[PDB]
Design a protein around this ligand. Structure first.
Ligand SMILES: O=C(O)CNC(=O)C(=O)O
Ligand SMILES: [Mg+2]
Ligand code: NI
Ligand SMILES: [Zn+2]
Length: 331
């Protein structure tokens, strides 16, 4: 078995190898990359996502989210308070202010320490889930707005034809902005490209050990657990590496820098934070191997996680028994 310790793998495709996206994903899996839950892909040196970022300040963040924490430094929840709209120019200036900027630090490790020690005491502002793309339409390789769609994968593998579309989303981050522990909707893959700015640190649990993280989460957030049988779908819970190590949960960590891709694999729990002002683009995708994960994916039926138009159809076709009760939570 390849990659039996479930380490995060890092790939350096040549420009020739960067032409066929599906084939490269299948290559990485042949090397065991999926066992980690997360892989890094460094694009060929000749490749670019676009020519410059010189005119991005006019993008609107219509609903910036202030991430307010509750709990203790290693075990907390966050709630997202909606703020008034601001442009990416305004947001970048805010990120660079004395109140919000990255503190002095020695290296990524000292910064990681400062994040876990100090995150709960602050409320950084995240511009998340903004529909759109920063890939130039002329970028032909690994353009996250030109991937094969999940609906088309389901049609090719299963013969069924369903409604729905699959488009990318932008994320504008600042120091301390946080993504809580989660898997993707319907335990899909995701791909995330860091277009610009400061790094993003990731934590991940191997898919084969995801249920260990779930059991710890039920112990650490016991009222949330009683409220919903899949409460990590709410994307509000944080657990530090120190707490994971104390509880024996297998995980790995890696820092993504500007110009790098990350891929998350089906049922790979992940969480992380941003080091400073940055912009990432991400989208879900599927392969044939995903289908069985989609059929088994948990769902939030308490109604908090409240998910997309396109996820309806996935549920309807892959989880017809759940269909019914799940759409009761989504209506
Ligand atoms: O970048 C972020 O804030 C969160 N992104 C992801 O969880 C992802 O790409 O799957
Ligand atoms: Mg602009
Ligand atoms: Ni994710
Ligand atoms: Zn729920």
């Amino acid at each position: 078995a390849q990659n039996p310790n479930c380490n995060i793998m890092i790939f350096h495709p040549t420009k020739e190898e960067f032409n066929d996206f599906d084939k490269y994903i299948a290559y990485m899996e042949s090397q065991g990359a999926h066992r980690a839950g997360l892989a890094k892909i460094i694009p060929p040196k000749e490749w670019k996502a676009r020519e410059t970022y010189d005119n991005i300040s006019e993008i609107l963040i219509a609903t910036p989210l202030q991430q307010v924490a509750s709990g203790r430094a290693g075990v907390f929840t966050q709630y997202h308070k909606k703020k008034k709209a601001m442009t990416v120019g305004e947001y970048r200036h805010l990120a660079n202010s004395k109140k919000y900027q990255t503190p002095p630090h020695q290296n990524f490790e000292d910064l990681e320490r400062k994040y876990w020690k100090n995150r709960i005491y602050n409320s950084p502002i995240y511009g998340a889930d903004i529909s759109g793309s920063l890939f130039d339409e002329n970028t032909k390789q690994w353009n996250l707005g030109h991937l094969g769609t999940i609906q088309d994968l389901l049609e090719k593998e299963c013969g069924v034809v369903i409604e729905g579309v699959n488009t990318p989303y932008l994320y504008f981050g600042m120091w301390k902005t946080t993504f809580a522990w989660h898997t993707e909707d319907m335990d899909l893959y995701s791909i995330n490209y860091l277009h610009l700015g400061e790094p993003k640190t990731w934590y991940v649990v191997p898919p084969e050990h995801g249920q260990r993280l779930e059991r710890l989460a039920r112990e650490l957030f016991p009222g949330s657990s009683r409220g919903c049988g899949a409460f990590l779908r709410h994307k509000v819970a944080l657990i530090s590496p120190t707490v994971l190590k104390e509880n024996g949960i297998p995980f790995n960590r890696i820092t993504q820098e500007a110009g790098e891709f990350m891929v998350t694999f089906p049922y790979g729990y992940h969480a992380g934070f941003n080091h400073g002002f940055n912009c990432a683009e991400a989208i879900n995708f599927a392969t044939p191997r995903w289908i069985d994960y989609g059929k088994m994916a948990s769902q939030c039926s308490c109604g908090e996680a409240r998910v997309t138009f396109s996820m309806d159809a996935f549920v309807r076709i892959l989880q017809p028994e759940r269909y019914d009760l799940w759409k009761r939570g989504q209506d």
